[PDB]
Amino acid sequence: KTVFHLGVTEADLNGATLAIIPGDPARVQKIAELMDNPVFLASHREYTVYRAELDGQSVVVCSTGIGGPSTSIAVEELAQLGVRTFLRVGTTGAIQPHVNVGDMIVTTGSVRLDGASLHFAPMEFPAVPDFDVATAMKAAAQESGATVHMGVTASSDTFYPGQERYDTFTGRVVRRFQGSMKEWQDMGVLNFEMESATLLTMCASSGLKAGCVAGVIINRTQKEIPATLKETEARSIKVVVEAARKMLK
Amino acid sequence: KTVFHLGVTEADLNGATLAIIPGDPARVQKIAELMDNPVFLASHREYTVYRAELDGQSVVVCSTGIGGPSTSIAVEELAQLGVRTFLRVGTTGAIQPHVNVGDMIVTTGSVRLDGASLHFAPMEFPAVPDFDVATAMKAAAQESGATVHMGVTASSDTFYPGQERYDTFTGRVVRRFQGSMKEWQDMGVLNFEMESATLLTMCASSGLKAGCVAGVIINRTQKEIPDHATLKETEARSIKVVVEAARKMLK
Amino acid sequence: KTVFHLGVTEADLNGATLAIIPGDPARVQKIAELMDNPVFLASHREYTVYRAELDGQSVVVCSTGIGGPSTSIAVEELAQLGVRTFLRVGTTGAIQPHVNVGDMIVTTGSVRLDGASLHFAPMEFPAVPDFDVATAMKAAAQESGATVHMGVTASSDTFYPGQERYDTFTGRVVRRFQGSMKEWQDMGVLNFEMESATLLTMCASSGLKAGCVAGVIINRTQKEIPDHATLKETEARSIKVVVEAARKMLK
Amino acid sequence: KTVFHLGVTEADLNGATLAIIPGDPARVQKIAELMDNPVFLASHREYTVYRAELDGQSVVVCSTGIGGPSTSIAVEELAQLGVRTFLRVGTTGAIQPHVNVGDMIVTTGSVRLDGASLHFAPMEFPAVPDFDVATAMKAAAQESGATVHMGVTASSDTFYPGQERYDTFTGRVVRRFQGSMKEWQDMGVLNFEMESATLLTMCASSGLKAGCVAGVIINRTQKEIPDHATLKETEARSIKVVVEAARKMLK
Amino acid sequence: TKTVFHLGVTEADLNGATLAIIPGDPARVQKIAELMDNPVFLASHREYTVYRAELDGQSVVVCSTGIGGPSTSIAVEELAQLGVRTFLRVGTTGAIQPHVNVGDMIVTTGSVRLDGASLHFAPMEFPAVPDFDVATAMKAAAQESGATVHMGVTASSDTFYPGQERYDTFTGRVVRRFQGSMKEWQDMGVLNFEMESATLLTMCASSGLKAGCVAGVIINRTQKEIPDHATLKETEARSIKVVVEAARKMLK
Amino acid sequence: KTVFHLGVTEADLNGATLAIIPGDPARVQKIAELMDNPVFLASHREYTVYRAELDGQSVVVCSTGIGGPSTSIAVEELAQLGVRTFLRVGTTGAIQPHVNVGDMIVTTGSVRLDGASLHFAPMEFPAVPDFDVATAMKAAAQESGATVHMGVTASSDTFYPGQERYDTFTGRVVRRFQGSMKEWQDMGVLNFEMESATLLTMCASSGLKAGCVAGVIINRTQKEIPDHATLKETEARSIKVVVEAARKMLK
Numbered sequence A: 001k002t003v004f005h006l007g008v009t010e011a012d013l014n015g016a017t018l019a020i021i022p023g024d025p026a027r028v029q030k031i032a033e034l035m036d037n038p039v040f041l042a043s044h045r046e047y048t049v050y051r052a053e054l055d056g057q058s059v060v061v062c063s064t065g066i067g068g069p070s071t072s073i074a075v076e077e078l079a080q081l082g083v084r085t086f087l088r089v090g091t092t093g094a095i096q097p098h099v100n101v102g103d104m105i106v107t108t109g110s111v112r113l114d115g116a117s118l119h120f121a122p123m124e125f126p127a128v129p130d131f132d133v134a135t136a137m138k139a140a141a142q143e144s145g146a147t148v149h150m151g152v153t154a155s156s157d158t159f160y161p162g163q164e165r166y167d168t169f170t171g172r173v174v175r176r177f178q179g180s181m182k183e184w185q186d187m188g189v190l191n192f193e194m195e196s197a198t199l200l201t202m203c204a205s206s207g208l209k210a211g212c213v214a215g216v217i218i219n220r221t222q223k224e225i226p227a228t229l230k231e232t233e234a235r236s237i238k239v240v241v242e243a244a245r246k247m248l249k
Numbered sequence B, C, D, F: 001k002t003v004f005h006l007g008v009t010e011a012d013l014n015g016a017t018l019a020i021i022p023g024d025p026a027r028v029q030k031i032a033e034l035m036d037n038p039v040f041l042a043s044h045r046e047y048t049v050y051r052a053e054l055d056g057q058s059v060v061v062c063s064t065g066i067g068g069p070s071t072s073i074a075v076e077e078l079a080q081l082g083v084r085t086f087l088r089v090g091t092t093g094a095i096q097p098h099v100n101v102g103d104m105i106v107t108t109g110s111v112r113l114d115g116a117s118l119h120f121a122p123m124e125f126p127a128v129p130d131f132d133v134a135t136a137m138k139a140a141a142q143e144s145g146a147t148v149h150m151g152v153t154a155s156s157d158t159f160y161p162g163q164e165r166y167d168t169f170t171g172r173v174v175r176r177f178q179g180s181m182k183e184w185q186d187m188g189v190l191n192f193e194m195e196s197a198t199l200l201t202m203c204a205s206s207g208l209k210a211g212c213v214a215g216v217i218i219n220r221t222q223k224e225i226p227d228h229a230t231l232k233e234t235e236a237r238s239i240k241v242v243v244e245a246a247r248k249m250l251k
Numbered sequence E: 001t002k003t004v005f006h007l008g009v010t011e012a013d014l015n016g017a018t019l020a021i022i023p024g025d026p027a028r029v030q031k032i033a034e035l036m037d038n039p040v041f042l043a044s045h046r047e048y049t050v051y052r053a054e055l056d057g058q059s060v061v062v063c064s065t066g067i068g069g070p071s072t073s074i075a076v077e078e079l080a081q082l083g084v085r086t087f088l089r090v091g092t093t094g095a096i097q098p099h100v101n102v103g104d105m106i107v108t109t110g111s112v113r114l115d116g117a118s119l120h121f122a123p124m125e126f127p128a129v130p131d132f133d134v135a136t137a138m139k140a141a142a143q144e145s146g147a148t149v150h151m152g153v154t155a156s157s158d159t160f161y162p163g164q165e166r167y168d169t170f171t172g173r174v175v176r177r178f179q180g181s182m183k184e185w186q187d188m189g190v191l192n193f194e195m196e197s198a199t200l201l202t203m204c205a206s207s208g209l210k211a212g213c214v215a216g217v218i219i220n221r222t223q224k225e226i227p228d229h230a231t232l233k234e235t236e237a238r239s240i241k242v243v244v245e246a247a248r249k250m251l252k
């Protein structure tokens, strides 16, 4: 009736079966403001929840927090309340030189460098989006006029060593991750983020539709920031909202 | 010059950048036969290579044989002569009761129950089709008015124990694969085949575009295997779909 | 300001080399209020930061959010700002019959059912606390008058399947975790939690000092589900115990 | 009493309990031709099947195609029809400088770099020939008067990256196989082929006798791709040797 | 009237002992029991030399384990069938941190599992951790000796040579897995190499038994590969006194 | 110039290139006394070392103790002093109903249920004997009139749970090994033993010749402790066979 972490009920969702799930609680409201009749529902820990409407239909907006453990909680509890479709929006670091700060990336498969995904399916199972959601997300991202890239995302449990950052307190990166970036680069992996491997594996093995779209906020091959930036977020959230439109009507 | 197993040259392909790759060599000619200017190129081991023309472009048809290892040879060597897109057509066993004998399945991702995918990318890497190919194949399948499913495929190095078959010489399945089919069923996996995990992982980690479309020849929830007039028909429909998909890619 | 997520500088910390790291941002304030001169520093995403004084020395307080990935960012950036000692306080589910709601557990080693710990050390490395931190935590816990258990904690990347919960949307639990609780019971594992394996492995392999203490808010084996009052007293006792442990660590 | 892929009944094999299993369908006839009363039985996909006699007893010749997946189908379906002894003959690449082209190698254990073996036994189980078969093979190989080597074989699911070939479309070798040849070479491993890991594991764990003998068609300390001048002579020796090994098994 | 397979002692022989001291080397069994009260030779079979003694009025077993977790697991299991619940290992170890000297004592607070037999008790993710009481008793016994005492992580290896990344061997070869592992353990703060603690701690920690491991540093791997003779018996002496003191504290 | 554990020199071995390596120190003298000129050399920890002569050649006899870690030190240190061939004789527990107490088993391959084998080669490498040594051992066993079985041996790092014994202090066997005996049984594994996986892998990957023969002292379909008289009988057979095997190697 009423879930452990989210602090909402089935009634609060008003028949919603699609969710937009940004990482940052501070983005939930932003996204809801782009839809119709946004209403605040609840906020507990990293879970801020809104209801809104698109084309006359209920949509839920719920933040995940950073990483797959907290993402998994959110997805499962919305699912218990009737949600069947999940559209993730986020920020990403690009690892290809042809990929630009400001570009959108739609994830066609994730490399599983996370742990939560294994709580749903064995390593050999693909971290793959629902086909309709990936489709809708590509359309939406191209409709924004930005450059869009479809493809493989490296989904890490850490922001630092698992993305091979060396500018850290120790300067160390464990063997498994030493040289990992060049390896992903040669395989044609586009980008780094931290939630998609869990999300996609969990959804694809559990009877749920999911996808991931992210705006590129940094490129790891050049490193340099241009600042501005907020527009990338602005574009990201317009695109995810658009994608939800296409899933609905 | 000449690639080692395929026995063809760059000139032989006549500028083709796309391939249809069935498993069965018998299918190579039947597929070429549906396009323009079918030309036989080579038959070596399990590799029978034709050239043909679609919309004024050369298309290669090349069989892979059964399993990832032999497929991996076909792809790599075709790639060396300049092929960049690979459309696999194969047969499959459904493991969902709603999926009927005759339906088509376009793989959106493969469970890697194979060995050869590991020779290209580590287990964590997704065995996923290139999105355009998968899109092309969906459209082609729908437009031919066939029941088409999009989903995850379990892609196994064996036909028997790795697909949890007990009607065998020993009757025994190793621990890893005992109860495995039911697990795949609970997760929503649609089908069993033997080549896609290798194909998809290889291509996606190598700068090549690939997809896998397969005709359902058996449903593993029913006991009784379907007849000859259905097998031959499934193959016929399947061949049509992949060629139509090839057309959509070329433009 | 000098770190990506936490948005503080080392100066903001006022000398602090010890941090108390609860999971819930809401509890950051309550912990700091048990000490001297609590000061709000920042709040970004799951990360709320306070400093305060214990016996005239600076202590930072910083939420982790739920799970190893968010925990790991907080620890690294706090380490970047000179923090060297990490006192984790949390809630836990018990799996031993002899451990009752309201007891304290001090982790002497974590079962690594997480993924982020593998980003600092391969699986064979022990998820173990700094001995000094564990000692201090035990002495703090006993001096509270509470019942205190020392032992192994199962630290899971999920709240549901990885803690073998079946009260879920699918009701399904992957093979790896089917029967996992029974196995942990038989092995004498004391409790389930979500951040200890990442924290302890990270610190033990990075020249940093860490321990974990948690209040038992449920016993999964017995189905002890407690009052809001009990839940409150337990939370209160935990926070108090961790502040005391902090006081013992301080020179 | 029939089988899915092979297209032959039990009667067709006329009581045969032993099969010679080359990889290449074109070697089936040639091996059959060295025996008595050879009869073509069937051909489907990579499976070409003959029957012949040695010393008044029936023997099956069946190609397996390239790799363990296609091999496992063949071995399983022969086994269903009463075959118990499997003698594989193939071509191999030698990785030790002291092994010459034209030499014979009898495998005494395989490095399992395949995937299909896992479908029969977990990785810890050795990929080991039946002692008798391997004895017969050694004897037959010596009698041919080529140099014969007994030892460990690396059996790979790929021709290219898993045998550390770099003259490829990408030139890329995944971390796991990057430096693998220098490792095998330093462990005294003798050669590379693609089927023995699957064959040996499968039989050794399933109540079946098996071995693998191979003609050296290339020395990998020299070149990557085999040249045609060589294939012809080494083949000739290989196929006589394996027929001699079979005669010896039958008594 | 139970009499175990390898040890060849009975429950009666232990006279109620619930604590054991378990050195690697049979030569040390008598030396340790000789530091105790009323030592009695019980049995010797294979690498298993067993004595009984008493300490602050309670029976104690001394039993060698031999080298490695396989032989250790047999001894621990068989002693447990006979009522033993607490196990204190003493041994030798090689230091891998520059600040740790020959002569120092190292008390293991957790082991890197580079063994095989630990997996026969618990899967890799389970921690090879001592019982907190024993480690405490061991810390305090060790400090009591006026040796420098170090608490930390120990790499517990199934080999003396490649697993501890020794190159001065027959082949000079080290398999990929252990190529450059020493530097990695150094970088992570790991203190020392030895061969029994992962099996011992994982086994007991998952089996309702109390265990710990204290070891004297016989070599520093920043200096040489092979351990020197002069250091041996002085470091042996202090080590066996430390373990005897730790058992006292355990017993009360 | 000496070795660290064995306390012997190259001089002490007097040119010997073959070793007989039993598990039990007690056995070393009894083996040596079956040859010419036995000479006690050293005894330190579990390593008793003798020298003797067989057909005018020096032979070393060196005990290993129980388990692969102590075995590995013994083989390494003997090899540093120029030993190249190692023949293990040990005791074993059969798991097949038709193997009797008293019988000999020569190992053709070991299931690697140990840890130390991984310190010389990764899991996929086969744990297999030198074919010459295994041939010598089979011959030595047949000619002495004992029953010999050739086959696969499960080589375990523990006596108890790794060999799926439940009559233990806990009655607990970890998931990995629950059901494993039946699995080994069903695959045709002959026996259980603790040293062969380490020895065979280490030697096969390091240019040394090795083998393992074992006297069956127990059958797990029986679970009985044998008579003093049948135990001593078996040991006498075991050692006679290994010495005869060593002789065939020197001829």
Ligand SMILES: O=c1ccn([C@@H]2O[C@H](CO)[C@@H](O)[C@H]2O)c(=O)[nH]1
Binding pocket: A023, A065, A066, A067, A090, A091, A092, A093, A094, A158, A159, A163, A192, A193, A194, A195, A217, A218, C005
């Ligand atoms: O290079 C990047 C850019 C963004 N993120 C995202 O940043 C968030 C944490 O700040 C995570 O949720 C993750 O998805 C990365 O992990 N790496």
Ligand SMILES: O=c1ccn([C@@H]2O[C@H](CO)[C@@H](O)[C@H]2O)c(=O)[nH]1
Binding pocket: B023, B065, B066, B067, B090, B091, B092, B093, B094, B159, B163, B192, B193, B194, B195, B217, B218
């Ligand atoms: O149940 C089935 C039916 C068909 N196939 C496909 O059939 C071929 C062998 O018959 C293989 O290439 C495989 O991809 C299966 O794997 N399983």
Ligand SMILES: O=c1ccn([C@@H]2O[C@H](CO)[C@@H](O)[C@H]2O)c(=O)[nH]1
Binding pocket: A005, C023, C065, C066, C067, C090, C091, C092, C093, C094, C159, C163, C192, C193, C194, C195, C218
């Ligand atoms: O049975 C329990 C009880 C508490 N927690 C803690 O509760 C939080 C989830 O709400 C996590 O941070 C975790 O540490 C569990 O994971 N499992």
Ligand SMILES: O=c1ccn([C@@H]2O[C@H](CO)[C@@H](O)[C@H]2O)c(=O)[nH]1
Binding pocket: B005, D023, D065, D066, D067, D090, D091, D092, D093, D094, D158, D159, D163, D192, D193, D194, D195, D217, D218
């Ligand atoms: O260097 C070589 C030489 C030959 N083969 C054998 O070549 C066949 C395909 O050409 C396979 O069956 C394989 O066993 C190799 O794998 N590698």
Ligand SMILES: O=c1ccn([C@@H]2O[C@H](CO)[C@@H](O)[C@H]2O)c(=O)[nH]1
Binding pocket: E024, E066, E067, E068, E091, E092, E093, E094, E095, E160, E164, E193, E194, E195, E196, E218, E219, E227, F005
């Ligand atoms: O550098 C060292 C020093 C000592 N030991 C210990 O030495 C004993 C055998 O010599 C083993 O028990 C092992 O624990 C090592 O493993 N490495």
Ligand SMILES: O=c1ccn([C@@H]2O[C@H](CO)[C@@H](O)[C@H]2O)c(=O)[nH]1
Binding pocket: E006, F023, F065, F066, F067, F090, F091, F092, F093, F094, F159, F163, F192, F193, F194, F195, F217, F218
């Ligand atoms: O059932 C048995 C019988 C004997 N051994 C052997 O017995 C010795 C220990 O008693 C070890 O060397 C081992 O190789 C077993 O492992 N299992």
Ligand SMILES: [Cl-]
Binding pocket: A022, A023, A024, A027, A089, A090, A091
């Ligand atoms: Cl976000």
Ligand SMILES: [Cl-]
Binding pocket: C022, C023, C024, C027, C089, C090, C091
């Ligand atoms: Cl908390």
Ligand SMILES: [Cl-]
Binding pocket: D022, D023, D024, D027, D089, D090, D091
């Ligand atoms: Cl062949």
Ligand SMILES: [Cl-]
Binding pocket: E023, E024, E025, E028, E090, E091, E092
């Ligand atoms: Cl010792």
Ligand SMILES: [Cl-]
Binding pocket: F022, F023, F024, F027, F089, F090, F091
């Ligand atoms: Cl023995």
Ligand SMILES: [Cl-]
Binding pocket: F164, F165, F166, F167
């Ligand atoms: Cl039993």
Ligand code: NA
Binding pocket: B046, B064, B065, B066, B067, B070, D046, D064, D065, D066, D067, D070
């Ligand atoms: Na094939």
Ligand code: NA
Binding pocket: E047, E065, E066, E067, E068, E071, F046, F064, F065, F066, F067, F070
């Ligand atoms: Na030993």
